[PDB]
Amino acid sequence: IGWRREGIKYRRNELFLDVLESVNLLMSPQGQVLSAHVSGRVVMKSYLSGMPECKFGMNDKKQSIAIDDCTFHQCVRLSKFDSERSISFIPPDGEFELMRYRTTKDIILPFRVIPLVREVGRTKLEVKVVIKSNFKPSLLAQKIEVRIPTPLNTSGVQVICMKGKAKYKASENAIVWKIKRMAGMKESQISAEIELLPTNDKKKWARPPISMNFEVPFAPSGLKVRYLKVFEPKLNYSDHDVIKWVRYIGRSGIYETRC
Amino acid sequence: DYMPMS
């Protein structure tokens, strides 16, 4: 084997699985989903003694989710998954990327955005934006940002938001709303008044989408890791002896709700 | 966060 050395020794035999998903979405103003996909990588941090063959299993089609197509680290017997749905491999030591993958079916959209806009005459905008967290409530979304674009003839913006904090970054012609943490199945809202300058009347505005960024401790695809079995047949340790850890990091990618 | 595997 060219990627792993033969005499590795660890007193403490531990491994760490990271499911890393970028979720991506474009939503019409009426709540219909125009496009959606997940890019995911699975990264393994492994400290295992010797040369262990590992079998890695998830919910490839409790639940069952449907992976569309994926690609593996060379270390994986491609044919061992080509007739049994069992990903098998001897891992490299240290950190490495076991697979990347993509997912479009039956996604979990961590947040729904409900924009509401009202034209108080040629001078004001009245605007409310509600976000709903749509995941298990024992879980905390963190690093929530709600970017609300503003017009170019803007002459000041007052806002109220009971949760979070909100600047008007006029350099970027948008309102940034920032929320440190939010639990699942919750509603938070922001209200804004957008004082306006007169503008060339014909030259008119098309509300660009409201974009979000967020991090959530679960895989939006619905993927869930089910086993990482470790067999090492020359050495007097076995599976019960390995200390195992999983974590999920679903990040936003393109996450635009259309106004 | 890292949870153990059950």
Author numbering:
A (entry chain A): 159 to 219, 238 to 435
B (entry chain P): 1 to 6
In the authors' words:
AP2 binds to transmembrane cargo proteins that contain specific motifs such as YxxΦ (Y denotes Tyr; x, any amino acid; and Φ, bulky hydrophobic residue) serving as μ2 binding sites. IRS-1 binds with AP2 to prevent IGF-IR recruitment into clathrin-coated structures and thus enhance surface retention of activated IGF-IR.
This region is almost identical to that for the clathrin adaptor AP1 complex found in our previous study, which binds to YxxΦ motifs of IRS-1 including Tyr 608, Tyr 628, and Tyr 658 via its μ1 subunit. In addition, AP2 would preferentially bind non-phosphorylated IRS-1 since AP2 cannot recognize phosphorylated YxxΦ sequence due to its limited capacity. Our results indicate that IRS-1 inhibits the recruitment of IGF-IR to CCPs through YxxΦ motifs in IRS-1.
